[PDB]
Design a protein around this ligand. Structure first.
Ligand SMILES: OC[C@H]1O[C@@H](O)[C@H](O)[C@H](O[C@@H]2O[C@H]3CO[C@@H]([C@@H]2O)[C@@H]3O[C@@H]2O[C@H](CO)[C@H](O)[C@H](O[C@@H]3O[C@H]4CO[C@@H]([C@@H]3O)[C@@H]4O[C@@H]3O[C@H](CO)[C@H](O)[C@H](O[C@@H]4O[C@H]5CO[C@@H]([C@@H]4O)[C@@H]5O)[C@H]3O)[C@H]2O)[C@H]1O
Ligand SMILES: [Ca+2]
Ligand SMILES: [Ca+2]
Ligand SMILES: [Cl-]
Ligand SMILES: [Cl-]
Ligand SMILES: [Cl-]
Length: 138
């Protein structure tokens, strides 16, 4: 029942958000030290991903995330029949914008099938976090 699904944060299907950050898109892509990541993530911004899951299970979520402020949090949601369902919310340690560190994001039950997942800038700060990737492990 072991399984591992790595998702590159830059590989979102769509991004969204109201915060006026002056960029072409509400969330942007950059590279640092060979790591391609999303940045300019503000409060209320989000990134959507479509994920195929062959093996049903209670997956553990790990993020390769950094932040340069206090009050950034990653909320992981799944779109369940046209309504977003909040799964976990994880504060991101303030250890530097480009300093990605493994971050435990809790667990989420995923059935065998295809899931729309959203990562949302849920924290209190105007500025939230940068993200290299996340992994779902069973
Ligand atoms: O004698 C007094 C008077 O003197 C006059 O000469 C002055 O004009 C003065 O006026 C004051 O001046 C300052 C002090 O009080 C206010 C007053 O007007 C004024 O305060 C400043 O106001 C600015 C707007 O005009 C700003 O708000 C400024 O705050 C800063 O603005 C920028 C720069 O540093 C940050 C700070 O908030 C902010 O930058 C953003 O910071 C984020 C972290 O908080 C983050 O780094 C953002 O960048 C992102 O970082 C990572 C995630 O995504 C990317 C992205 O680049 C990257 O990977 C960053 O943009 C405020 O101090 C008279 O009183
Ligand atoms: Ca933004
Ligand atoms: Ca990446
Ligand atoms: Cl990917
Ligand atoms: Cl939680
Ligand atoms: Cl769950």
């Amino acid at each position: 029942s072991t399984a591992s699904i790595a998702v590159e944060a830059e590989n979102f299907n769509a991004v969204g958000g109201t915060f006026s950050d002056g960029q072409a898109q509400p969330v942007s892509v950059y590279t640092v030290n060979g790591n391609t990541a999303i940045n300019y993530v503000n409060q209320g911004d989000y990134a959507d991903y479509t994920i195929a899951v062959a093996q049903a299970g209670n997956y553990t979520i790990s993020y390769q995330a950094g932040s340069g402020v206090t009050g950034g949090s990653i909320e992981f949601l799944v779109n369940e029949n046209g309504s977003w369902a909040s799964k976990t919310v994880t504060a991101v340690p303030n250890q530097g914008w480009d300093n990605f560190q493994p971050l435990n994001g809790g667990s989420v039950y995923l059935s065998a099938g295809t899931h729309q997942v959203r990562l949302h800038g849920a924290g209190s700060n105007n500025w939230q976090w940068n993200l290299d990737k996340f992994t779902l492990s069973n």
